[PDB]
A paper describes a structure:
Phosphorylated arginine residues (pArg) serve as a degradation signal that is recognized by the ClpC:ClpP (ClpCP) protease, a quasi-proteasomal particle critical for microbial protein quality control, stress tolerance, and pathogenicity (Trentini et al., 2016). The ClpC protomer contains an amino-terminal domain (ClpCNTD), two AAA (ATPases associated with diverse cellular activities) domains termed D1 and D2, and a coiled coil (M domain) inserted into D1. In the active ClpC hexamer, the D1 and D2 domains form two stacked ATPase rings that power substrate unfolding and translocation.
To stabilize ATP-mediated contacts between ClpC protomers, we used a catalytically inactive mutant (E280A/E618A, referred to as ClpCDWB) that binds ATP but does not hydrolyze it. To resolve the functional units of the activated unfoldase at higher resolution, we performed a focused cryo-EM analysis of the single hexamers. The resulting 3D map had an overall resolution of 3.7 Å and allowed us to build an atomic model of the substrate-bound ClpC complex. The most prominent feature of the cryo-EM reconstruction is a well-defined, 80-Å-long density that penetrates the entire ClpC pore, proceeding from the top of the D1 to the bottom of the D2 ring. Five ClpC protomers (P1–P5, P1 as lowermost and P5 uppermost unit in the AAA ring) interact with the substrate through conserved tyrosine-bearing pore loops in the D1 and D2 domains, while the “seam” protomer (P6) is detached from the substrate, transitioning from the bottom to the top position of the spiral. These structural data are consistent with the previously suggested “hand-over-hand” translocation mechanism (Puchades et al., 2020), according to which nucleotide exchange is coupled with substrate release and upward movement of the seam protomer P6 to rebind ATP and substrate. In conclusion, the cryo-EM structure of the reconstituted ternary complex provides a snapshot of ClpC in the process of unfolding a BacPROTAC-tethered substrate.
Numbering used by the authors:
A (entry chain B): 717 to 807
B (entry chain A): 158 to 408, 469 to 665, 681 to 806
C (entry chain B): 206 to 408
D (entry chain B): 513 to 614
E (entry chain F): 206 to 247, 255 to 285, 295 to 307
F (entry chain F): 615 to 662, 682 to 716
Write the structure that this text describes.
């Protein structure tokens, strides 16, 4: 439970920092549950989770940015529409 | 009640401030107000401006002189003359018993018969040295009795480390002076600084300055110059451009190209690297790579994608740009890729800070990396890697044979991969922000279709060292099978280099691809790395030059072609 | 007056002169002139062979002949090595016999560190000098000091200082200003606050 | 970690109210627990909530002080030994900024 | 000008005076007399040197030259100050 | 002539390596000293015929880096000492 909570918190912090570049971004809660789904408490916590949010969210946005799809001022969400990361880009 | 000597040997900021000859002072409002606040006290009015050389301490003194005449002071400083003085100009002679103390007694006697002098001493860390070192009548031992009773009023201007070193004379010197820390202005602050006085250098040089010009001046002085601060660097570039444009006008507008030109002439990077690649170096960095590097194209495109991802990205600036580990055999191109990217990232690289971790074999060997404790052997400089990066904190670190580290160093490595900026020195925190940390890995050759090698090497990393460690590292760049045709290709490249060198010496050699193939087969074995090929071509060329110059069979200026037509190297000069 | 720097050695000597004028001193000490013999103002204009020790000879002869004169020396540790040259008969040696015989009536003020550095180990002149150490006033003595001194700082900043503020300045300075000493550091707080308040009143 | 957070907050408000013991430090804590639970992120959280840059946090990494003679790096080396003049990697750091989080 | 002895550093100042006589020099530096200093021919040397400084103040077109600048800055007593004033 | 180079250390070794690369050493003032017509001859005992012809390279590539070997002009080896 605290793990999904900290997913929410890390996403909030990430959007906070991305506001430095005037980018408007959102994370669906489904993406948050999927992201936490990789992190497990069996061995240790919150390290794999932070690296996972970083990797998936940020790298995927960079991919859909250098592919030119989005510029600043646009609205973006990373959603899980089919059971896996995908970009809806509400713009 | 006038001052002959003090006016003779110390410039009067107030006088030349009346004539508006003083350049403007922009910003620094909080600092100047604090200076006035300290000057308003009754017993120790003396403030000591502590900063770095070139930050604007004397600028704060000038601004104070300005505000004095411009009815800005709170009437307790109304009509008070600020006089810059330097002890070096005072001493001027030591071979005689009491000349210097006499000059300074005269100066004190003028400060008495006046109330409006507040003597601004630059670099007063040299106020304790004069005469006898620390046991005779130096400058301080005769200033202090006057300084503590408000007899004398002062404005010192030191440097931070000089304050720390020469306030160990605490007892009087510290309490006599209140520090005012002045820090070097930021980018934007400095841009506004320049925009303050562009109409001074414009009027001096009759040249027109643009706003993007000074923006580039500031950006450049930051990126490509170190060991110098602001607004010094900025105004200096601007004035150099003004002078150079004025000259070019004889045998009327400075623009960014001129700023690039002066920074290039200063540091030594060519102008094409500075200006045109400012945001397109990542655009053609893959071109640069695949030029410098031949083979492993999948690895190089992976690296390019990663570095442009981190580059045109939102990644936390704090932590280092790129953490890549190259899995592969040795001689497959590990260093060449590094030097190439660095030459493309930090143009004209000469920057790969190579460290062989196989030399740092054991546990205590890590003290060689960071440095010894204070009370131990070899402590003064030490810090191989730490001092290396402290020198130029803008480069690409390559760490050879990451495997051979005792587990004691992996801790330091992961600390670095944890936001960099590690404090692993004798009290020095080194910053790894624009750098790129790259690690030469273990063999990893046995596993080297694509996915198969991939899962294999991942398991080999699991077994080899921590999974968390690679969870820190960004990318796994795999150096695939050894060269087969890239063999002949790199022979061709090296031989192109050597043919250029031989041509500038008034000769011309053209070795056909058959001889290239023979050199390829000889030089490097299938098991062995591709490094001895350098030696192989060196030996063949030195043999041919030795024989042909010794024998005299060939004549200079006649093109030289080598072939394997007889099964051996045959030289057909004509 | 061996003691730490911000303690008030010079202040003690001045208190002695003030007592001389106020007549509080004993009859034997009544009507004497405290002089502040600086070495910087002594060794100044010589640059020759026989001028520094000449000035000092004349000074000593005046003192001996003049009936009533006390000589206060800031930074006593400068007597040693003063007239440093080829001649190298420094002030410390010209005064030594006269100091011991008792005619030249000195009052030295030094700093404990300067005492141990080069008047204690390097002189063998801590014979002609009685080391009456001076050290930090107590937390309460500092309050009495500063409150007795409050009028001058009022005058200079042209404000009024509430006595609770003086108490608070001393008590705070004691807790965390560790590097300095009283009453110097307490007075520093009062003085900077006076400057800040006057400057606020201005704007 | 409501327990840890409230403990820290109580400490800092004892300090900032006029009640803390003027002799000994603001507060001392030992943060036990598994790897990755956030017991280092609380330190940054605290320095940020109490200061600005959050780099005022004076941090020592006891993974390097294992050789038991490095203790002469916290306090300087003795007098007649190398590195006597610049002594106190920890001591001077704290002497500069006395209101800080070690 | 930094260089080893005999490399022709003063030759550069000489060729500079040459290009000054010609038109290669721009206008701001036009009308500039380059001189030197004879420490021998100049109690009273300070008087003469201060007089020299008066004449420097008179016409601001006298680019002076100094060989062995370190051992010169004596004269520093009024040169280094006069440098600051300009 | 450098004798007992084996007694050197990887730092002075890297120093002399970049020298052998260009001769340009810069010590105590950044003095760009030139190595125009100097000779660099290093002397040591890694040996201590053909089997020796192999062991020499063995202990060279085994005692220090191969790049320093690769800055070869020529390698002079004499094994027999009595005749
Ligand atoms: N706010 C400012 N106003 C005026 N000049 C400035 C300002 N900031 C930087 N400078 C320039 O920086 C240069 C060096 O500053 P200065 O204080 O003389 O360095 P230092 O601190 O070593 O004396 C001066 O030429 C000054 O004109
Ligand atoms: N992909 C490549 N493109 C061009 N040259 C290469 C490539 N791979 C290897 N080389 C050659 O290999 C040599 C580098 O050897 P080195 O980097 O010392 O090997 P290692 O990295 O194993 O120590 C260079 O001369 C370089 O020309
Ligand atoms: N409750 C939490 N709130 C915020 N960040 C947390 C939390 N728990 C863990 N983290 C994150 O996990 C890491 C903290 O683990 P840490 O205490 O450093 O573990 P250890 O020191 O045992 O390796 C940081 O990356 C931090 O941001
Ligand atoms: N570039 C040059 N062209 C012509 N003559 C030169 C040049 N460089 C040096 N010289 C000669 O060097 C001689 C004097 O050198 P000088 O400048 O006095 O050495 P230094 O710089 O050590 O004082 C002169 O005769 C001058 O002609």
């Amino acid at each position: 439970k605290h793990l999904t909570e900290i997913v929410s918190l890390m996403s909030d912090q990430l959007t906070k920092r991305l506001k430095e570049q005037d980018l408007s971004i959102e994370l669906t809660d489904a993406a948050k549950a999927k992201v936490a789904e990789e992190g497990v408490d069996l061995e240790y916590g919150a390290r794999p989770l932070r690296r996972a949010i970083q990797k998936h969210v940020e790298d995927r946005l960079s991919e859909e940015l250098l592919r030119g799809n989005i510029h600043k001022g646009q609205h973006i969400v990373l959603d899980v529409e089919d059971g896996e990361f995908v970009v809806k880009t509400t713009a | 009640a006038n001052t002959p000597t003090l006016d003779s040997l110390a410039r009067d900021l107030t006088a030349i401030a009346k004539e508006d000859s003083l350049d403007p002072v922009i910003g620094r409002s909080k600092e100047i107000q604090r200076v006035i606040e300290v000057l308003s006290r009754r017993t120790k009015n003396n403030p000591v401006l502590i900063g770095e050389p070139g930050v604007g301490k004397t600028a704060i003194a000038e601004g104070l002189a300005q505000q004095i005449i411009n009815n800005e002071v709170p009437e307790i400083l109304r009509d008070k003359r600020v006089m810059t003085l330097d002890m070096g100009t005072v001493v001027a002679g030591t071979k005689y018993r009491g000349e210097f103390e006499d000059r300074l007694k005269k100066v004190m006697d003028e400060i008495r018969q006046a109330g409006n002098i507040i003597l601004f001493i630059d670099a007063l860390h040299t106020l304790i040295g004069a005469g006898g070192a620390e046991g005779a009548i130096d400058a301080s031992n005769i200033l202090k009795p006057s300084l503590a009773r408000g007899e004398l009023q002062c404005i010192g201007a030191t440097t931070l480390d000089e304050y720390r070193k020469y306030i160990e004379k605490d007892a009087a010197l510290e309490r006599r002076f209140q520090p005012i820390q002045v820090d070097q202005p930021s980018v934007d602050e400095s841009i506004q600084i320049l925009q303050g006085l562009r109409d001074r250098y414009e009027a001096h040089h009759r040249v027109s300055i643009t706003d993007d010009a000074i923006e580039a001046a500031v950006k450049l002085s930051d990126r490509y110059i170190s060991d110098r601060f602001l607004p010094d660097k900025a105004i200096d570039l601007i004035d150099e451009a003004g002078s150079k444009v004025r000259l070019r006008s004889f045998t009327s507008e400075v623009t960014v190209d001129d700023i690039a030109m002066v920074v290039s002439s200063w540091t030594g990077v060519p102008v094409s690297k500075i200006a045109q690649t400012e945001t397109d170096k990542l655009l053609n960095m893959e071109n640069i790579l695949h030029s410098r590097v031949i083979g492993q194209d999948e690895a190089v495109v992976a690296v390019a994608k990663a570095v442009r991802r981190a580059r045109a990205g939102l990644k936390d600036p704090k932590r280092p740009i790129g953490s890549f580990i190259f899995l592969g055999p040795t001689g497959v191109g590990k260093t060449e890729l590094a030097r190439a990217l660095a030459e493309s990232i930090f143009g004209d690289e000469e920057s790969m800070i190579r460290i062989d971790m196989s030399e740092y074999m054991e546990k205590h060997s890590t003290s060689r990396l960071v440095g010894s404790p204070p009370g131990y052997v070899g402590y003064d400089e030490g810090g191989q890697l730490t001092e290396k990066v402290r020198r130029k904190p803008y480069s690409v670190v390559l760490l050879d044979a990451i495997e051979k580290a005792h587990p004691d160093v992996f801790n330091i490595l992961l600390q670095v991969l944890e936001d960099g900026r590690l404090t692993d020195s004798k009290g020095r925190t080194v910053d790894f922000r624009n750098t790129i940390l790259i690690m030469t890995s273990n063999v990893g050759a046995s596993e080297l279709n694509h996915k198969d090698m991939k899962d294999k090497v991942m398991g080999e990393l699991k077994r080899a060292f921590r999974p968390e460690f690679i969870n820190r590292i960004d990318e796994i760049i795999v150096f695939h099978s050894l060269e087969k045709k890239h063999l002949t290709e790199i022979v061709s490249l090296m031989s192109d280099q050597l043919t250029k060198r031989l041509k500038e010496q008034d000769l011309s050699i053209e070795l056909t691809d058959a001889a290239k193939a023979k050199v390829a087969e000889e030089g490097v074995d299938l098991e062995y790395g591709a490094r001895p090929l350098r030696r192989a071509i060196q030996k063949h060329v030195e043999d041919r030059l030795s024989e042909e110059l010794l024998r005299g069979n060939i004549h200079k200026g006649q093109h030289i072609v080598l072939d394997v037509e007889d099964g051996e190297f045959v030289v057909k000069t004509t």
